[PDB]
């Protein structure tokens with residue numbers, strides 16, 4: 001594997017002699033490596049072509065978004081071209097790209113304090129304003145039905161019916177949760193379809209670890225993981241951030257007694273996010289901010305459970321029950337979100353008042 005990785009790196013216009021190439025992060029989707037040279041560092045990624053089969057359109061999107069950010073003077077992912085001059089390469093059956101390593105940054109897999117999450121809100125709120133500069137038609141959907149929760153639920157039911165590994169028998173309570181909540185999945189798609197929720201270009205994977213913060217100041221430096229930028233609703237970006245970051249625990253926390261929905265963290269993110277968007281957010285969008293957290297958490301939880309039932313073909317895992325463990329944290333969070341619905345509505349109202 002090491003020899004193969006060094007060979008891959010040799011296809012790119014790196015500006016130093018490679019000393020090591022090692023797995024970096026715990027991403028579920030692409031395979032990411034840190035390339036350390038005698039000078040600069042790089043991120044080398046093998047794109048998951050099972051999930052992103054249309055590499056040409058994916059890289060066209062990434063090139064467009066990054067070049068636009070650069071034209072505005074913003075720090076972003078800097079593609080390092082192949083020695084042949086291309087934005088990526090097919091090498092020995094894999095699709096590979098390289099970015100410059102963004103130095104002097106911190107990222108977080110869990111909110112350590114409310115200020116970090118407030119800053120995350122500012123960063124993703126600001127990113128909505130950036131993406132509003134694009135026509136929906138400029139950025140291709142890299143994955144269809146991506147936050148179409150009813151479509152995700154159809155996929156879940158298919159996984160359940162197939163029950164390829166006989167795993168359904170051991171996750172009855174979790175299956176029942178997603179079945180019983182089925183009435184709740186259509187709200188955003190219904191509003192997009194009838195024009196009552198604006199169709200906007202969105203990031204679509206707004207977990208906290210997709211923001212790099214400055215290692216000294218804590219100020220957002222750059223939003224990363226640009227692979228799912230495509231038309232959607234602002235509510236997908238807000239709700240997914242709340243899913244991941246308003247939790248008191250890791251997404252794959254095995255001890256459910258550590259998992260809670262924090263209204264303090266909800267408030268911190270809301271203050272940052274709405275602060276960037278207050279005069280643009282529609283009445284209907286504002287009405288749905290609290291529930292968007294429930295919706296995206298249920299969608300992701302359902303996807304984890306579907307993957308568990310399918311033998312973990314979608315998300316990377318470290319052990320057999322990993323996706324079940326992930327699905328369970330999402331369920332616990334939704335149950336707590338339901339209990340705090342009046343509070344979160346009040347928080348949104350207060351932020352709307354003070355901004």
Ligand SMILES: Nc1ncnc2c1ncn2[C@@H]1O[C@H](COP(=O)(O)OP(=O)(O)NP(=O)(O)O)[C@@H](O)[C@H]1O
Pocket residue numbers: 024025026027028029030031032043077078099100101102103107209210224225
């Ligand atoms: N340009 C960069 N500079 C520094 N770190 C980076 C850069 N690009 C990616 N990373 C790191 O790579 C890891 C995540 O890569 P990412 O492309 O977000 O993974 P993904 O698999 O496509 N999505 P997911 O698997 O669900 O996390 C994180 O640990 C980031 O800190």
Ligand SMILES: CC(=O)N[C@@H]1[C@@H](O)[C@H](O)[C@@H](CO)O[C@@H]1O
Pocket residue numbers: 028029051204205207228251300
């Ligand atoms: C391309 C893709 O499926 N990305 C997913 C994202 O949708 C999901 O919310 C997250 C859960 O941690 O894992 C990945 O980042």
